[PDB]
Symmetry: D2
Subunit: 232 residues, 4 copies
């Protein structure tokens, strides 16, 4: 294999370190000061972008030219596996006493809309291998964010029922992680293939981090600033 996954693992570990050290959202949570409203604001944006993942994954298989047989199957298989996953986030929001309808009628925050656009773009154009970079960190993510999830669970005294989105991830994503890694070794033939994977891995994570910044800004404005939300 031409791809060195220890090198990608190293870049991902460096990026999370920065995100967790600099995000006020993450510090607020780890201090033990997360609230229902904060968790909802954040789960709402997760719902918004997650809603498009099956679709943009399937798009690689439609737009990609001369993909290896295994890669075309992979795209449709995983699109099928991801379909509806956003409902788990919407279920978690309902589990903490909020209205599913307020979420369904909401427009995504600008950072989230920006991530959504990026993911369709890199799925519809360029080196068809590149979306695997998103999947690479997206699937081996539980190992870095576990302390943040454990702190939210403690502060809001949540049960696995109000945390289904992150409970699916750490069970059948230890398999999906293995599947992504095997697919990466199969489809990466040149260094240009690897470079495109690294470029998408990096930017998709940079863009996902900006969502935390939008979530935090709207959370602060939430007390007075804007009529954007409903506290019950």
């Amino acid at each position: 294999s031409i791809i060195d996954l220890t090198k990608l693992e190293q870049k991902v570990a460096t990026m999370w370190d920065s995100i967790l050290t600099n995000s006020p959202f993450i510090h607020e949570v780890l201090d033990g000061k997360a609230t229902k409203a904060l968790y909802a604001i954040y789960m709402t944006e997760t719902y918004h972008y997650t809603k498009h993942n099956a679709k943009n994954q399937a798009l690689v298989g439609i737009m990609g030219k001369d993909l290896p047989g295994k890669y075309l199957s992979f795209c449709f298989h995983h699109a099928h596996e991801e379909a509806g996953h956003e409902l788990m986030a919407l279920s978690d929001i309902a589990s903490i006493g909020f209205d599913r309808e307020d979420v369904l009628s909401s427009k995504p925050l600008p950072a989230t809309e920006t991530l959504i656009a990026y993911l369709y773009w890199i799925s519809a154009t360029g080196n068809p291998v590149q979306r695997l970079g998103y999947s690479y960190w997206a699937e081996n993510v539980y190992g870095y964010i576990d302390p943040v999830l454990k702190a939210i669970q403690s502060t809001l005294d949540l049960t696995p029922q109000s945390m289904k989105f992150f409970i699916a991830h750490s069970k059948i994503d230890a398999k999906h992680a293995e599947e992504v890694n095997e697919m990466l070794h199969e489809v990466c033939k040149t260094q240009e293939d690897v470079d495109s994977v690294v470029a998408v891995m990096e930017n998709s994570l940079v863009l996902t981090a900006r969502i935390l910044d939008d979530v935090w800004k709207e959370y602060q404005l939430f007390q007075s600033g804007a009529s954007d939300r409903y506290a019950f």
Copy 2:
């Protein structure tokens, strides 16, 4: 359920009757006059449109707005099930002594390119339910074409190895027909939904029938003055 599948079955039966009674290609086969070249020309075009089915099926799931949960799952599941199916046609061509490379480097015939265009268009636009009309006759075809298949097998003395495309996935095909029928009852809520399914069912079959015409024209030119083929 608002859809009456016996009515759809009746329209399909009427259309096949016409196609089988009027296609010179079909009579040639039934007359016991099929040749390796004829089967290969035909399987090559099947290869060209089948190559796109997984892709246009997945496309309904991407372009359709507010699809029932079961239908979005259905689109991606079925795209996954169809992925690679064209390889079975390629394999049958190889099985009768021809080169897989001459197929891979060939351009589809005009009627085949026309069907491909149509199926992408009805998958990307309009009432998202409509592609199920294509699937309706397509998953339930073997019963009408069985005699044509049996005659090809006899003339060219073929084994199941040279006929994977039409009889490898027979148990799978029976399950897919049931799944399409169940999905049709599920997603058709208004008569406009049903009409869109019927329009696509009809036109996709009309366009598929034009492929037989192109195959026959090029076959007659094949034993003559069109060096478009190799044998």
Copy 3:
């Protein structure tokens, strides 16, 4: 230049000869038997595919990779020139006493939907030069269909007001034919480029001819048992 437009002109002339000699629609008109209903059914389908021409022309410019500068400009310029042209067909229908709303709420006939699908497909995929084949015959049609137009004008005693679609933009049409020819010499660098232009020219005209067949079938049903229309 690598393209020989006299060769293209010869293939187009051969194809029209066939369409005009075999279409019952064309003979009906030439026999002096056109009616308002017949012209409206036909203009309604013209409206349906013309509605998409600006859009699929613009699409070549968006999907084409590394197009010569002049060709990208050409695609967007011509899309701009074509925008709204379907309104002229709508206007002609209104001019002979029918309701513009019955046209706007109608679904295209299957053959028309098939042409629309094909033109988007060849604009979105393949050799980006190929749509120019459609334009080639389409901008240079009036000379072959002139007698049919003249016969319609006589039977239904039409003025230029009821025939805007075919004779309002005549000076503009002559300039567009020249522009397509110049662009063809400019963008065709290899024989594969030329072949792709010829394939599209041929199939787009074959598919347009199928519209005449659908128009005739529905017209015969119109004075009978298809309440698909209003008169």
Copy 4:
């Protein structure tokens, strides 16, 4: 008319104020310390996103459903007017002694790739009116960035020949600005139409500002850090 352009003008003026006050790139220029390399790095990214503008403008006309007649014409007309505009940026780069080929073979910076994705997305989906928001600030832009352009012209002692991209803008964009404003009044029927225009105006400008940040980071790394560039 339902849209109040003085309100949009006010939001744009507030955003530029922030961008110009906080961008190290902009301060570096206004101090009189811009260099050929800095101008090239920046013009290269302008080239990258400008290259797609005619295309994403034409896309609104292809994807938009039931657009007013004047709006469909507008989309194709303006796509035609924008076609090739990126060549002016590439011409400016050549005018200061750099190789056009180094630009053509370069991949856009992540912030630029992110803007490109966003613009196609908002052009292919949602309320078809919304891309006019990008055009709104894009066309009435010369009035805020004029001092930055005048400082670059002085430091690098440039003639109108090495500044064709920003010389086209301030002549036939006083017409385009008027055309956008007239089109906005024509196509905005509801407040939801206006809101979509405002949302795109804001995010497209936020995303364009991030390009300045990527340009600056790569410019600093340019002395030692990375082999990404060529100083001649």
